[PDB]
Amino acid sequence: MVSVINTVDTSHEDMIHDAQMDYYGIRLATCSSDRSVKIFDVKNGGQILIADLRGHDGPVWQVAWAHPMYGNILASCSYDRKVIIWKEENGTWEKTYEYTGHDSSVNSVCWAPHDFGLVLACGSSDGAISILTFTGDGPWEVKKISNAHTIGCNAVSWAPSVIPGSLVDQPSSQKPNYIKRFVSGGCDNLVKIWREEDGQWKEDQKLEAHSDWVRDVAWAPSIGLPTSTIASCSQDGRVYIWTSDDAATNCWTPKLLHKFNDVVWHVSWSITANILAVSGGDNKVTLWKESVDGQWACISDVNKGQG
Template identity: 30%
Template structure:
């Protein structure tokens, strides 16, 4: 039986992102009202706000929790071109406005920072960000202090793919000096404005990223960049320069869509691309013993796609990484806003502009079927 609850949000604008902590007992929400709220689940299953604060000077794009072994940390990114690291002070009372405080402000981006994610804990405290200037940045703190973060690498993705990206390995002190001098990324970027690298809020630049969960392959990230529906697989070995491993491209003939018969799509009319097949969200599945990787993507054309990526002996004839689309689902019929795998990589959750959340699971025939649909409007009607 599926159970759900409604959180009486006190955000004054659109909620742009939500993230559970490692244990699933706390939930952080971010909003276009520039605020972050942290919720705590009670013993009766209800959720209450334990802290709320203004975090940025523009709408917040994404938030992420660190692994608990690194302490209570939150990272947030915004259209104000900054990333902020927040640390919790348990000595302060809840709802005091002082429990979470900013310990670092990262200002290297020349465009809106659209996504960020902490690396798997095996690699230590590392934070990857992607922004509309098409730079993938990897940050680390100058331990034992968490107040000074510096970029380990910041490849420009189109240049890296073309093979003419010059490795950038700033000295740790360089990043610290820039922040001590108060350098910023310039005025806040408006929606639709061009960035320094030619990207813009409508199409170009990087939009989303997801870490490979298997430490065997090192620090590897899947990045949605550009407007052609491609996903770039990039390795970030340290201290070696970044390496482009693979492009998952939709230039090949698309598979027939597979809407669920039990849960029909929003519309029977084929979905036409909304300007492009731009990738809006990406999620790398935990391997859990598989000999291949699964990467899910969502895009503006309304499709959820699942890619099978092979490496080593199971890859192409040249032993390089290879990938192919193994499933396409267009049940949402609208832009896909989020895809996310469960902890075993067996169930995929997707949400879209149709206002629905769908759960997907592979059948014995390796076809992905829709297990359930959650409809916010239907839930409201029941109240």
């Protein structure tokens, strides 16, 4: 589909479970069953391993870049029940924090919108979700949601930063009390929405449409529309698009995107075009876009091996 670009020999010894570009698209973080997190500085072509970060005792499942306003920070989560925060200072990568407050595998990590501060959500196979907060002064603060999912949490995704009433006149200097939300998917077949109220996290909604384990959840970035959109995928081979047209009604409507013949592993939103990337057990990556009639169409099918 797209013209062929650089090939990166990662020198790995196993399957890369997940990969994320940094905010400016100058670096690629990758993580594997080999227990390493590898960072590549692929600027203007030129594949370049710049760090091999070792600190996990098991397979690393997900990596998340923080917003560059806090410097070059990377989170990783693993089967070893740990979340590690890596920071680059003067071109040296170091472990700056380690969180061990989960009793089972930590399957997903997601940084909050930078407007909320330096906040990390972590979903675990112990069924809990932990919110790690860095205030600039002292240790990381931890708010743990115990029994968030009955069997295990597989995925976490933050809601976009929305200022309530952004079309209402306000003073030049003021603090915008953001509604902090995130979505989680679990092994109880539920997609759950969470809200911060009075410094505590509460379950705001349960979304029931999957018939087997929710594998991934992705909150669509705000494109300046009032409609909030979430994608979820599951072991049942379904992908759902959840829409909420009014933030006051909290009414979420599921629309079936597609049903694959195999498991769907990950869902990811394009920042600018509301395009959903869907990764299946069939070793395909499909791209989906909503048409003007509200129908979802597959706009590309990317097979392993056509590069």
